[PDB]
RNA sequence: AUAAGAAUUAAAUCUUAAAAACAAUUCGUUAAGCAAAGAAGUAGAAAAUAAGA
RNA sequence: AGUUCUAUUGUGUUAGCAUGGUUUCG
């Protein structure tokens, strides 16, 4: 089963932290028999509102990352719990990849008709 | 579950695409009953099932 | 040379008194209450006169201020001037109520206490007896 | 959310009226009154049924009154059913 | 009401007294 | 419909096979060229040992590492692969090229390729069956019987004359076991 | 005096726009030539 | 002898739109020679032109306001996704080139230019400049009245706005009519809407932040459900607000920013032809070869092929007018 | 802009692209084409000569 | 301009088709000829003020019911003494009064009226489309 | 072939919403089409609008 | 059948709605498209249905 | 006691009080338990439930 | 009608989350 995960790291997060988190996620995928498909960086984006992350602070933007992976359905709960426990991550969401409207295929001309 | 039902069909089918013959229907209904019984053992609070 | 060859009779060009949308018939008393609410919210200006209230306010302000009225009463003066200029040639409206106008269109539903009048016969009957023989 | 209005080259009374209109069309007072006190589920069922039955009638009668006012203002006459087979030809 | 508020007031008073003592 | 350029597309007898996209590695480029040459097959290929030197000379003219040399040598020394063999065999079967089908089937049956049985078994069986049927002389029923039994996972549907003469989890999983393609 | 018939209303829209532009240019040209004649008469 | 474009089309309003009436031919071609001969002969005949040819009629309201409303509705129905406008550049599609009514406009502009230069020759440069300024003022005044369906026409002719007959606010779904922008947003790109479409979700949310109902959004039930899910997920991901419309900086779709930049530059170079956008895309093509430039490259190839075809046609005409142009009528009709 | 609400440390890739573009297209050069896009090219193909 | 239901089914009108109208004319011509072949027979004509001023609004047939208790009474009850044929142009309006009238009735009406009020065929004896 | 239609009787019954303050469906959901219902074409005369998606796959 | 034939012809040729646009009887608003019997759309669909009755397919009659 | 807050038809119980850390109002920050406000026309298939007063 | 697959799921059970009335802390 294919899935896409979107993460929003804070400014305090570093490249080393991102690499560590991705390594942990790939370890979970391999444990659940899956395989990481792709990883991409969607740039720095301002939040629609200030994120008050308790015991971490207040943030006004974040760096957005995306990774797509095929894995057994049982891995999603573990991945979600791990991402929630991670400190730097501000927000995360994992969804089932769709045939047409997915970042792997429907990745260009999402706003420009011509 | 679909793979297991396909295997039972290939075992008990009249021809390659026969899925409605009463033998194949019996096999598929048995498989579905077993799957729902397992699902109920897990989600014992799912009353509609 | 080229141009329209038929009359420009489109009801958009020539708006007509009609309801362009139908609706399931409404209970007569419920419709009457809704129309009363609409009229109250609109505040149909059937008062003694639009200028009467402005004149009353102006006179009251003058009475309250007998010395510095020249400077005090200016908003009231401008309002009264506007009212005189706008509703000076004001005539009270003479039209049927929207309730009757919609009873004409048969919007409402006959209840126990409301029935549409039967078609007139005495007024509409026209008879012409002529010889027909030979 | 909270509506923000800028009182610039206008009357504070007019701006307050616009704010009141926003509140009325958003049902803010209705929700505040609802949450000020407990509403039992059956009462809510009855209220929602009543509203869903009532408001379309009000909208239709509002449209009818708008048409009546327009016709009175423009001195429009009652329509006659369009007779078919009329050539609709210009008298020119 | 008049139970939780009183209990929390007493709790805050005791906590402040203890912290000042410490 | 190439998303970006420059690119290298490969068509196998008027059929898209692979596309090398821009910004690829030297190893990937060499693998692409080798695969194209293998699928296509006076003419010769540089030795896998000298492939690294050839690539370095080409780069110098256009304008190595310890791991890069090994990667290039291994990639150039690799033989034909499962995708290439299966595509060639399928096209040959559709074209009824007896000698081709025969040679490709023999290469696929080669013992060294037995590691790819899970991917090549059905194609191998059907290639054998097609060769037996397309043989000029009328097909041998006894020979056909063995292949048909292998394909069908049983011999109860064959003519009689041609037919050759404990744990809980294990027992309940034996039900879903069928051995036909 | 006789104008063409088109298949779409776009054509009539643009035809009318062109007609208006041409008429404005005609007015300007007539005024310019009248001024030309007046200047010539004054000079002579 | 300054032409009309040299004289008056350098102004803002006058210079905004400048249609082309004749093909441009490089010096040294039969077309150029014939154009030179025609211009000389036309100038001489303008010198020997009579008064009756410059007669003009007073301007009047081309349409009533109600008729203008009807025409606007019909044009919108003709093109429900696009906005109605006098696409005088696309004119050739609707009006055959041989029956273009703008040849008169072109010749009148030439005549006006000739008249102004002769007036400058006769009376004096200062008077010529005065008259040129006055003509510029007149053109500016009459700029916005040419379009019968525009508001400039109504303002020029002093016509009161139409008071349309009341219509119901609550109508059946059969009659719901969205605007072209809402229509494009709802259709998306033939793909169901996802949370990643942050460039469009603002349409279906009110200023209050509440998601708009279906009667207001004019969306199908399935589309409404998809949009609701997309907005909920975006809000939970904190890329879409909770209590207001998204800020102008939040309108990028969830995608690669460089791919978004490539898309925007392609859109600019196609709609208007920004040479800066073309150069930026050219450099990006090599700097970031991992993005998608299919549409940009396809448009470039189309333009190059059209240029080559035009060059071949010009060579054929120079050798002698060939059957290509005749075919463009006869073969097209036969097909 | 506020230092605690803005984004810092990011690359000006767009500015770099503009600066590199200046090389292919001089900054003191035309901003548009003789025919401005699809519509202008359609007009060019659909206007006859003399 | 319209915000109402759009019907999908159209009903034909056999009673007012060409051949049926021709047969109506043929059958009514014989009765009219036979009636005129006899002397001292008058024909009443009834219509509506909006489809005819000059025509008198009162005649011998009219009864002019004035009491509530007389509402059910017909207004053309006595027309049989004077007239031998009632030519009606408003059968929908006069249906309740032409019902079981003791003189022949020749009605003129439209297919729409016939289909919307088919009961007028129980009060009309001869039909002229 | 001449074959009669099958019965319009279906197992389970008809949608029921649990009584009380839960809002849970005791059976089936609000989109359920009863067997004794007109055609989809009859119920949706207009059909897809011009701005609907031709392909409903997500 | 005109309900669908008119929709087809209008979708193919949207410009037919201009004709007699100011004449009462032609309702061209969205959701109606109901024209008079003398409108070009009505004549087109009438001819198409006549040919279909004569025994042609919808597309052949359209052509 | 008293005023203020709160509440009421009007009052009272109740809380704070003498320069304020939680009576009440404004502003931040977490914490706790809890969870249909916003998005679906019982309307339009001809589709219709019960002689009468 | 039933079985299989297909596209869609405001249906029922589900680990966790975003938001919010209320109370709470300063």
């Amino acid at each position: 089963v294919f899935y896409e995960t979107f993460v929003l790291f804070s400014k305090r997060v570093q490249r080393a932290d991102i690499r560590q988190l991705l390594k942990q996620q790939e370890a979970l995928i391999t444990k659940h028999h899956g395989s990481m498909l792709a990883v991409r960086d969607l740039g720095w984006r301002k939040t629609a509102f200030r994120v008050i992350k308790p015991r971490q602070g207040i943030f006004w933007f974040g760096r957005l990352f995306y990774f797509s992976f095929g894995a057994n359905p049982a891995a999603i709960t573990e991945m979600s719990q791990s991402l929630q426990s991670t400190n730097g991550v501000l927000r995360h969401a994992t969804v089932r990849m769709k045939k047409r409207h997915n970042l792997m295929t429907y990745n260009h001309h999402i706003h420009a008709r011509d | 579950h679909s793979w297991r039902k396909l295997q039972l069909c290939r075992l008990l089918q009249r021809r390659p695409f026969d899925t409605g013959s009463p033998a194949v229907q019996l096999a598929c209904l048995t498989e579905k009953i077993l799957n729902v019984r397992a699902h109920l053992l897990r989600h014992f609070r799912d009353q509609q099932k | 040379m080229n141009g329209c060859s038929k009359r420009k009779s489109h009801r958009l060009l020539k708006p007509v008194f009609e309801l362009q949308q139908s609706f399931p018939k409404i209970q007569h008393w419920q419709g009457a209450e809704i129309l009363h609410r609409l009229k109250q919210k609109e505040k149909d200006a059937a008062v003694i006169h639009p200028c009467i209230d402005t004149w009353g306010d102006y006179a009251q302000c003058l009475r309250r201020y007998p010395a510095t009225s020249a400077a005090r009463c200016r908003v009231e003066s401008d309002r009264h001037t506007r009212c005189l200029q706008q509703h000076g040639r004001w005539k009270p409206s003479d039209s049927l109520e929207a309730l009757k106008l919609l009873e004409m269109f048969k919007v409402f539903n006959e209840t126990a206490r409301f029935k549409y009048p039967p078609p007139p016969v005495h007024s509409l009957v026209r008879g012409c007896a002529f010889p027909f023989s030979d | 959310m909270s509506c923000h209005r800028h009182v610039f080259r206008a009357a504070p009374a007019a701006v307050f009226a616009s704010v009141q209109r926003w509140g009325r069309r958003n049902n803010v007072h209705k929700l505040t009154l609802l949450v000020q006190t407990y509403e039992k589920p059956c009462v809510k069922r009855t209220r929602i049924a009543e509203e869903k039955a009532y408001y379309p009638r009000w909208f239709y009668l509002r449209y009818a009154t708008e048409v009546i006012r327009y016709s009175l203002k423009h001195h429009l006459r009652l329509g006659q059913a369009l007779d078919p087979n009329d050539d609709q030809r210009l008298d020119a | 009401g008049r139970s939780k508020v009183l209990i929390r007031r007493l709790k805050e008073r005791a906590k402040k007294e203890a912290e000042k003592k410490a | 419909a190439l998303p970006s350029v420059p690119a290298l597309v490969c068509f196998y007898r008027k059929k898209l096979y692979s596309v090398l996209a821009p910004g690829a590695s030297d190893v990937a480029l060499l693998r692409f060229l080798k695969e194209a040459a293998d699928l296509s097959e006076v003419c010769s290929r540089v030795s896998p040992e000298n492939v690294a030197e050839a690539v370095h000379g080409a780069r110098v003219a256009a304008a190595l590492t310890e791991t890069e040399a090994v990667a290039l040598e291994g990639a150039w020394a690799e033989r034909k692969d499962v995708q290439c063999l299966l595509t060639q065999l399928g096209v040959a079967m559709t074209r009824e090229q007896a000698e081709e089908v025969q040679t490709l089937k023999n290469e696929l049956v080669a013992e060294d390729r037995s590691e790819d049985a899970v991917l090549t078994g059905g194609r191998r069986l059907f290639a054998e069956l097609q060769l037996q049927l397309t043989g000029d002389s009328p097909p041998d029923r006894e020979a056909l019987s063995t292949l048909l039994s292998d394909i069908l996972g049983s011999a109860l549907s064959l003519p009689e004359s041609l037919q050759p003469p404990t744990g809980y989890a294990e027992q309940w999983a034996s039900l879903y076991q069928i051995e036909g393609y | 005096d006789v104008q063409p018939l088109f298949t779409s209303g776009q054509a009539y829209w643009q035809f009318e726009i062109a007609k208006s532009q041409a008429n404005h240019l005609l007015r300007i040209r007539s005024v310019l030539r009248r001024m030309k004649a007046q200047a010539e008469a004054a000079a002579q | 002898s300054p032409s009309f474009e040299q004289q008056f089309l350098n102004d803002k309003l006058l210079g905004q739109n400048t249609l082309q009436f004749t093909k441009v031919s490089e010096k040294g071609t039969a077309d150029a020679l014939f154009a030179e001969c025609l211009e000389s002969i036309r100038h001489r005949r303008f010198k020997l032109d009579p008064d009756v040819d410059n007669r003009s009629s007073e301007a009047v309201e081309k349409l009533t306001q109600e008729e203008r409303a009807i025409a606007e509705k019909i044009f919108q129905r003709v093109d429900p996704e696009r906005k109605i406008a006098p696409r005088l550049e696309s004119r050739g599609c609707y009006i055959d080139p041989l029956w273009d009514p703008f040849k008169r406009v072109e010749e009148l502009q030439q005549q006006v230019a000739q008249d102004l230069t002769e007036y400058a020759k006769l009376v004096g440069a200062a008077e010529a400049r005065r008259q040129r300024l006055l003509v510029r003022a007149s053109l500016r005044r009459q700029y916005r009245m040419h379009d019968p369906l525009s508001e400039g026409h109504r303002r020029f002719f002093g016509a009161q706005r139409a008071d349309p007959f009341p219509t119901p606010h609550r109508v059946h779904e059969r009659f719901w009519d969205p605007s072209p922008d809402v229509r494009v947003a709802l259709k998306n790109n033939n793909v169901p809407i996802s949370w990643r479409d942050l460039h469009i979700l603002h349409h279906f949310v009110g200023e209050n932040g509440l998601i708009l109902p279906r009667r207001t959004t004019h969306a199908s039930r399935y589309q409404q459900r998809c949009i609701f899910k997309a907005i909920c997920m975006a809000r939970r991901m904190a890329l879409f607000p909770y209590d207001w419309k998204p800020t102008q900086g939040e309108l990028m779709p969830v995608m690669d920013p460089l791919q978004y930049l490539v898309d925007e530059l392609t859109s600019r170079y196609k709609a208007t032809g920004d040479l800066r956008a073309d150069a930026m895309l050219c450099v990006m093509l090599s700097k970031y070869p991992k993005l998608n430039y299919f549409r940009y490259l396809q448009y470039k190839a189309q333009t190059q092929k059209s240029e080559v075809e035009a060059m071949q046609q010009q060579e054929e005409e120079d050798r002698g007018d060939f059957s290509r142009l005749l075919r463009k009528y006869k073969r097209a009709t036969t097909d | 802009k506020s230092i605690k609400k803005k984004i810092t440390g990011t690359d000006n890739v767009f500015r770099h692209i503009m600066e590199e573009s200046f090389a292919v297209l001089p900054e003191d050069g035309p901003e548009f084409e003789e025919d401005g896009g699809v519509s202008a090219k359609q007009q060019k193909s659909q206007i006859l000569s003399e | 301009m319209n915000f109402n239901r759009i019907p999908t089914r159209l009903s034909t009108h056999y009673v007012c088709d060409p051949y049926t109208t021709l047969m109506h004319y043929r059958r009514t011509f014989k009765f009219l000829q036979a009636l005129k072949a006899k002397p001292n027979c008058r024909a009443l004509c009834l219509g509506n003020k909006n489809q005819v001023i000059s025509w008198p609004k009162h005649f011998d047939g009219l009864t002019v019911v004035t009491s509530a208790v007389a509402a059910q009474s017909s207004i053309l009850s006595s027309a049989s003494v004077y007239y031998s044929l009632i030519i009606c142009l408003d059968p929908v309006l006069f249906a309740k009064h032409l019902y079981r009238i003791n003189v022949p009735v020749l009605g003129v009406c439209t297919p729409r009226e016939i289909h919307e009020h088919p009961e007028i065929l129980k009060v009309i004896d001869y039909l002229l489309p | 072939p001449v074959v009669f239609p099958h019965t319009r009787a279906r197992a389970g019954g008809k949608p029921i919403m649990m009584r009380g303050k839960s809002g849970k469906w005791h059976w089936l959901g609000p989109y359920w089409k009863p067997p004794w219902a007109p055609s989809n074409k009859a119920r949706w005369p207009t059909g897809p609008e011009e701005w609907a998606w031709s392909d409903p796959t997500r | 059948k005109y309900l669908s034939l008119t929709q087809a012809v209008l979708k193919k040729y949207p410009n037919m709605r201009f004709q007699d646009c100011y004449v009462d009887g032609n309702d061209w608003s969205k959701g109606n498209d109901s024209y008079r019997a003398d409108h070009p759309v009505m004549q087109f669909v009438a001819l198409q249905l006549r040919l279909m009755n004569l025994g042609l397919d919808r597309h052949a009659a359209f052509r």
Side-chain angles (χ1 to χ4, degrees), chain H residues 194-241:
Chain H
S194 177
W195 74 284
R196 308 196 305 107
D197 304 323
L198 290 173
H199 64 300
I200 281 171
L201 302 184
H202 63 263
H203 281 106
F204 321 107
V205 62
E207 157 174 2
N208 195 22
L210 302 175
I211 300 177
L212 292 176
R214 217 170 66 82
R215 64 173 190 267
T216 308
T217 56
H218 297 163
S220 310
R221 296 169 176 81
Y222 183 50
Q223 301 183 317
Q224 187 78 352
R225 290 190 253 98
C226 288
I227 291 167
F228 184 86
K229 293 175 177 181
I231 287 172
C232 286
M233 181 169 177
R235 283 184 175 177
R236 260 171 179 80
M237 270 295 297
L239 295 174
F240 187 91

Side-chain angles (χ1 to χ4, degrees), chain J residues 38-52 56 61:
Chain J
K38 202 160 188 177
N40 57 45
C41 54
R42 296 205 301 171
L44 178 62
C45 182
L46 272 173
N48 222 30
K49 60 162 66 180
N50 305 319
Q51 62 184 99
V52 65

Side-chain angles (χ1 to χ4, degrees), chain F residues 1-5 21-23, chain H residues 285 289-294 297:
Chain F
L2 285 174
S4 303
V5 295
Chain H
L285 171 55
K290 293 285 145 292
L291 298 171
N292 203 358
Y293 309 94
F294 174 73
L297 296 169

Side-chain angles (χ1 to χ4, degrees), chain H residues 39-96:
Chain H
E39 287 181 352
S40 64
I41 295 171
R42 281 200 292 266
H43 274 242
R44 295 194 182 89
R45 288 171 67 164
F46 299 163
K47 295 182 182 180
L48 291 182
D49 262 0
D51 191 322
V52 295
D53 291 0
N54 63 32
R55 74 186 191 279
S56 63
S57 55
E58 292 171 324
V60 67
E61 298 187 16
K62 303 152 176 180
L63 292 172
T64 316
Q65 291 299 285
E66 291 75 356
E67 301 183 7
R68 185 207 174 194
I70 288 171
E72 289 176 326
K73 295 188 193 306
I74 297 171
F75 280 111
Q76 193 63 90
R77 295 219 63 182
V78 176
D79 301 341
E81 71 287 347
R82 190 173 52 183
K83 286 304 304 179
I84 67 185
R87 304 175 188 89
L88 310 169
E89 299 78 357
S90 73
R91 190 57 50 245
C93 304
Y94 300 90
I95 293 177
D96 190 300

Side-chain angles (χ1 to χ4, degrees), chain I residues 10-30:
Chain I
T10 62
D11 296 66
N12 275 324
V13 62
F14 39 88
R15 313 302 294 187
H16 309 342
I17 294 159
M18 186 97 69
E19 294 168 357
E20 187 70 351
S21 307
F22 291 153
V24 298
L25 179 71
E27 187 175 7
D28 301 65

